[PDB]
Design a binder for this molecule. Structure first.
Ligand SMILES: Nc1ncnc2c1ncn2[C@@H]1O[C@H](COP(=O)(O)OP(=O)(O)NP(=O)(O)O)[C@@H](O)[C@H]1O
Lengths: 314, 317
């Protein structure tokens, strides 16, 4: 039981549990160059046949931010040639783009990168994208949502499989990855970005998680268990929700006769889908219009009113 | 608005949302002597009639741990007199009863305190006990449970009203409580939790939260919104789990054939109920028998075995 099987074990556990790969032939990996993506790439190449995968390629997006961006790219290309993998690289002034598009460098880099990945996925014929997101990212994301404001979705954070994205390392904790990378003497790009605490993610990773571990050494493992519990509870809530939805939402309204009597949790659920919004406040504003007649003005010029035992727009 | 309104609005906001007081006539305040308690009292005394209380009393518990704990008892005795309030003081060797019963000083103090409070409540006839538990406490508890691994149950933390307890400062932030006490030129016992980070709660408070608030200064406000959503969903899951429980349970067993195919989330909550344990592993361990017939052992000699379409506790031992 070494740093390698320890991980492979968790990755196969994910497979059995989530059907991470189930027919996909070509896997494009979002290759940052960092440990995670490296360890990930090593695991997919090893489990390639186990997954019945015809191909595994890397896609590296050069943000043009770090002054090392140019060298890191070259390292990725070399990493690709090394393992004889197809490598597609995209470059875009994340800087400019963020400005001209009033976006923050982060979401902008996210946008341009994912846009690049799809460009390659779609134009080169790969069936999905693999991402090195791991259990610690999951932990960090969830704590970031807990901090910024959230519901189950935030707490659950990302999923092991969503649309064309696959996160094989989902169950793996950073420390295991880091050990894995070591055990197998892998190479990788440094996380310069790391420790700029000015970034919430790093704040959580470097200040919060550490303090939390003084109370629970096994924070990551107990967390994952929390998430699992939450995910099924969430699924049940969403299912039991859709049911209530098309049983009350008839046409362009909501049979308030039925909603009011049904469970608060579900109401907010139905209302959330209908209203198109997801913030606690608005949702709760529309909901009031189930006992208290009237109307309510919300976001993008849209408003809903209560024509007696029905709730529709305006 | 001024610091007074800032707090009272929230206290009334809570009354509306939870019906904190709805008939109780004699309120026993768990009076520590700290701001929360001071402000809680000040506030409840300002709403005495509003809430239709026939009497508000103080109940201070001397843990007998700190040397100051003495001046403290005397403070509450004075405070109580300054307010013309009935107060019930209580000395107890926390340190001694102390975990001779195997339990952290806190655990014991908690026990003895609430024992003492529940004691005063029964003997002197109080309808409930009001605590100074506030929004920052909730935030702290939630993170504590978040940390210690848990589900919605721990995520929700304590409720604003529960059994014989009431927490009027639920929506109130610690800072609002402090601005308030200062604004009203109130006196109170110093905190000191800043010298006991050794305790998880205290660590979350002084070393964790402050950091989270550099990301979102309104963390408390943001946090409250999540609790509201979660409490609802948890209450829903409980209703369902509870129904399914009574549905699948026969005698001292569970009809596997009938539970085996209902939603996972409910299977887990039902096992929990039956099993008498909340640990994920114990629970999954038992769930495994819904499809895989056999036997399983948990902790205190309690072993479950699946007999045909049934799942029961083995009577051995
Ligand atoms: N000396 C005391 N006398 C009476 N009540 C107290 C005293 N100390 C603490 N309490 C009470 O409990 C609150 C203070 O927080 P404390 O009880 O110490 O939190 P905790 O023990 O960490 N867990 P929890 O009780 O659930 O918040 C006050 O609002 C009182 O209700």
């Amino acid at each position: 039981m070494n740093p390698e099987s320890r991980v492979i074990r968790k990755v196969l556990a994910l497979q059995n549990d989530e059907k991470i790969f189930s027919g996909e032939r070509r896997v494009l990996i979002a290759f940052s160059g960092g440990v995670d993506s490296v360890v990930l790439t090593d695991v997919l190449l090893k489990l390639k046949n186990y997954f019945s995968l015809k191909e595994v390629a890397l896609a590296h997006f050069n943000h043009m931010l770090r002054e090392s961006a140019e060298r890191d790219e070259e390292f990725c290309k070399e990493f690709a040639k090394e393992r004889n993998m197809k490598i597609f690289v995209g470059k875009e002034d994340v800087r400019a783009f963020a400005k001209e598009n009033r976006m923050s460098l982060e979401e902008a880099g996210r946008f341009l990168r994912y846009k690049f990945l799809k460009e390659i996925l779609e134009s080169e014929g790969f069936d999905c994208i693999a991402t090195a997101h791991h259990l610690n990212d999951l932990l960090e994301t969830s704590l970031l949502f807990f901090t910024r404001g959230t519901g189950l979705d935030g707490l659950i954070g990302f999923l092991p499989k969503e649309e064309v994205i696959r996160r094989p390392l989902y169950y793996v904790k950073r420390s295991e990855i880091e050990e894995y990378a070591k055990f197998k003497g892998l190479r990788w790009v440094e996380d310069e970005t790391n420790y700029e605490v000015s970034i919430p993610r790093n704040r959580i990773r470097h200040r919060v998680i550490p303090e939390l571990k003084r109370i629970n050494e096994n924070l990551e493992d107990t967390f994952l268990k929390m998430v699992k519990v939450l995910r099924a509870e969430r699924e049940f809530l969403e299912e039991e929700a859709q049911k209530l939805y098309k049983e009350v939402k008839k046409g362009n309204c909501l049979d308030v006769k039925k909603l009011k009597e049904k469970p608060l949790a579900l109401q907010r659920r139905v209302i959330r889908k209908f209203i198109g919004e997801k913030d606690y406040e608005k949702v709760e504003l529309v909901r009031s219009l189930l006992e208290k007649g009237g109307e309510v003005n919300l976001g993008k010029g849209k408003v809903l009113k209560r024509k007696e035992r029905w709730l529709c727009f305006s």
